Symmetry: C4
Subunit: 93 residues, 4 copies
């Protein structure tokens, strides 16, 4: 539970970081910068807001390598430590 909370906070900070970076360097609206950060770190990669600057491209490379680990860690704990038990409880006859 404390584990999920740390991961939750780490994910938030990471996304705020991306939001600030892309709005500044790539000139994205903050909402689009947040959207892009999430779509990037979850490896979805629609591509609509991909970086046009070299600074943006270099940050994105580093952001992916550092961010993917904690975003999927959070997703994994959410799925295993939260969603799993809930669905089960909704089964209990």
């Amino acid at each position: 539970d404390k584990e999920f909370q740390v991961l939750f906070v780490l994910t938030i900070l990471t996304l705020i970081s991306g939001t600030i970076f892309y709005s500044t360097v790539e000139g994205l609206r903050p909402i689009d910068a947040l959207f892009f950060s999430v779509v990037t770190l979850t490896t979805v990669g629609y591509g609509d807001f991909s970086p046009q600057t070299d600074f943006g491209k270099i940050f994105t490379i580093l952001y992916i390598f550092i961010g993917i680990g904690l975003v999927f860690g959070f997703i994994h704990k959410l799925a295993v430590n939260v969603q799993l038990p809930s669905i089960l409880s909704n089964l209990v006859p």
Copy 2:
């Protein structure tokens, strides 16, 4: 077997949810909304039907975080608990 069935039903409900959301908010044809939901939760992300509204972008963020866990759980069980044994049976000399 009951596990695969629950996951199958959970995946269906999740996809119906996306289908309804994107057809409503993003104005997609239902088939395109379903297609987009799948392409999103499997992390493929072609990008053709990416959300243009802020409401769409925010939902997509939440949808990804909540949906990826159960979609890949289903894929994983399908692969391990279903495809694996079948291919093996097709080997049995």
Copy 3:
């Protein structure tokens, strides 16, 4: 070793299936159809050759769910049962 071989053959058949489907239904050159099949099942999803027909979209949904399991199984075995040992052997002082 026999495991890697089965997975290798299963991956090939799956890709041939996609190649045939997309060249037929989506009118892709065979090379582009193969490329699209791989880019889809590995979840990269550049998006250049995404399906424009409903038949194409529906197949793609099913193809993703059935194909991702065996493509990543193959990738995983390749990495663990093949690449891992080789790199190690190149270390042995």
Copy 4:
């Protein structure tokens, strides 16, 4: 630690390989070729720099299958063997 170092070097070599290939065959600026290599092997796949030549498409197929294993291995070790302990240390009361 030696494991992380090998993976770090293997990831670098792999990315240099992609960088050289795409700048040569697809005529990308080196920075864009590196960016594309990373976006490919991490399965993000924005799609802006996708290959237009058959040679590019064929290499990309092989590059994905061979590269994804080591890139995610590196990401996994980075997350487990490096990020995990650090965040923990920042907790120690």
